[PDB]
Amino acid sequence: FVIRGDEVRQIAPGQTGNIADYNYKLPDDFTGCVIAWNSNKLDSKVSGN
């Protein structure tokens, strides 16, 4: 998916916020990996997306 760069800290076990509890929640006993990279060159519009 695509989220705001600052909200990237909300994708983690034991976290709280807005995206964490309303859009995507990870379990406390979660195993795996998370990969996020900047994509302002690909998903940006001068008018606004």
Binding site: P13, G14, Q15, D28
Partner: protein, 49 residues
């Protein structure tokens, strides 16, 4: 500080001994006793029973 328990920093101290017959320089706190000779006794010399 808002990370999960699995990502909070932990301070680690590792103690490595080299227990050997060499004359020990570090010893635990014990008490000495007067020397007794020429009879069946139970002795303890620098941890050697």
């Amino acid at each position: 500080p808002t990370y999960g328990v699995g990502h909070q920093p932990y301070r680690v101290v590792v103690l490595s001994f080299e227990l050997l017959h060499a004359p020990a320089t570090v010893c635990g706190p014990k008490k000495s006793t007067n020397l007794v000779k020429n009879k069946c006794v139970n002795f303890n010399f620098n941890g050697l029973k």
